[PDB]
Design a binder for this molecule. Structure first.
Ligand SMILES: O=c1nc(NO)ccn1[C@H]1C[C@H](O)[C@@H](COP(=O)(O)O)O1
Ligand SMILES: O=c1nc(NO)ccn1[C@H]1C[C@H](O)[C@@H](COP(=O)(O)O)O1
Lengths: 289, 289
């Protein structure tokens, strides 16, 4: 109970329990998992706090760069790489594309992935250079409309799971849908993750959606509230138990705060240089993985 | 702390926690809610079990008839009515259609609600007497194809949230999507519900998705596992508090068991007369509501 960072103490319990009571799907490719199906955690977003884990470092520049690019509607991993964020690099190089049958496609065309769904759900996908405006349903714009105009609503959902388009995507969505909620003048987010690695993706995903809620709040003139993180397949790679065991023994620091250093016109008006992360205090970089 | 029915003893606390920890959203006019954003619940489905609540009775004829109807792909609430299930009657009769602008629509054309999404996602909706076979993505067929050919998949997802078709729908989807997961040759389901009444709809919903998992499992040759119930807006109506306080008093009975009385060719081959609910033992009806 008596922890500075109580929200992170909790995530450490979650890993502990997956280790303690999860089921193994083993192998010898070295890719085996330990799994709990169905998990839920909450983090407080109040006072500018963003849940970037302090016990293991999170790649803030990729979290930061990739989210701006999601919102921007883009599906060219080329723009992302120009900023030296390479997390989408293996999924867009020519060998991945051709192996998937996507042989009429230029490098970096990831297909109708997240940005495309978020801002043009149901538009007809052509390529990453096509202008898709007025096409498909812009879910992010509508999300902003609802928080402002209909705060009590229980249908503030934005989704990237489009069954119609999933075969054209380089990967299926892993963060599948989210729900915003306003109560008492504070904005909240619940996120559904179909599947997540608890030493890599779940932590990066956590930080991505916290940033989104801080960004979306500033736009609708609300104070941020709580992020609910619901996991579908919350798993651990069993060849980092040693690392996760160390990390489970590190007392967390406080979470960093987000500062927006100028005014924004819309949710399309953030940039790298106006989002400040203050006091991201982190433990030493971990040995095994 | 030995409760015959632990999974439902939990339901009582769930409500109890909304009662004592929840957020008010009052109204003058008798429809006020006390609400918690972000909740999760698990239920055992092993050895025939199905989470139909014993402390307040659930309408099984409605659960049964309506789930069979979703699967069929149907959007005609007149079919649902022919069987004397009246849950969709309000939203399909003509004062509703017209007040939504759906004035070229016959009674009971509910639009592209759950069944149209579940079996023809992305198809072009015309009416409820239209043959859409081969049109759109059959998500239930795909869910079955994966459970069987690809049990390990972390992508077994059927979802009724289609932003393109939402405006043509008499009601937004409350149960927005679900994930399926196999471990141990036992099949579980995690349900996402954007919003829910904890004394009317969450318990009807619980039973529907539990019955679906028993049905889908029998078809794939798997044992039923566990049902994970996640809600976004989990709420209790303010007027029903007197009633829920008693219901919380009541001690649960063991959950009933489902039995299938003949073999099935597909998920399209269940009927009412072959799904048997054994020993649904319940408390008396509530003196308040
Ligand atoms: O944790 C993740 N977060 C992601 N963000 O999108 C993407 C992936 N992952 C992890 C989850 C699984 O380990 C893997 C996805 O593989 P899949 O669920 O089998 O498609 O990547
Ligand atoms: O609990 C529910 N379960 C449903 N499943 O079919 C459908 C509706 N409901 C309840 C939840 C809300 O109280 C209400 C609809 O939520 P709303 O669309 O935000 O009004 O009905």
């Amino acid at each position: 109970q008596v922890h500075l960072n109580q929200d992170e103490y909790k995530y450490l319990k979650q890993v502990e329990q997956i280790l303690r009571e999860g089921t193994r799907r083993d192998d010898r490719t070295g890719t085996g998992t330990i799994s709990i199906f169905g998990m839920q955690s909450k983090y407080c977003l109040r006072n500018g706090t963003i849940p970037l884990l302090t016990t293991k470092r999170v790649y803030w520049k990729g979290v930061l760069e990739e989210l701006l690019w999601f919102i921007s509607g883009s599906t060219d991993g080329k723009l992302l790489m120009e900023k030296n964020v390479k997390i989408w690099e293996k999924n867009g190089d020519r060998a991945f594309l051709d192996n998937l049958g996507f042989t009429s496609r230029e490098e970096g065309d990831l297909g109708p992935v997240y940005g495309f769904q978020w801002r043009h759900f149901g538009a007809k996908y052509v390529d990453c250079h096509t202008d898709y405006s007025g096409q498909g349903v812009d879910q992010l714009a509508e999300v902003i409309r609802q928080i402002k105009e209909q705060p009590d609503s229980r249908r503030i959902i934005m989704s990237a799971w489009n069954p119609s388009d999933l075969g054209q995507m380089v990967l299926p969505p892993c963060h599948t849908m989210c729900q915003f909620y306003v109560d008492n003048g504070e904005l909240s987010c619940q996120l559904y993750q179909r599947s997540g690695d608890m030493g890599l993706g779940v932590p990066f995903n956590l930080a991505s959606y916290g940033l989104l809620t801080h960004m979306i709040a500033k736009v609708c003139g609300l104070k941020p509230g709580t992020l609910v993180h619901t996991l579908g397949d919350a798993h651990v790679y069993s060849n980092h138990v040693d690392a996760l065991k160390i990390q489970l023994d590190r007392e967390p620091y406080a979470f960093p705060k987000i500062r927006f250093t100028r005014d924004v016109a819309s949710i399309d008006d953030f940039t790298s240089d106006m989002i400040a992360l203050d006091d991201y205090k982190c433990h030493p970089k971990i040995p095994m993985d």
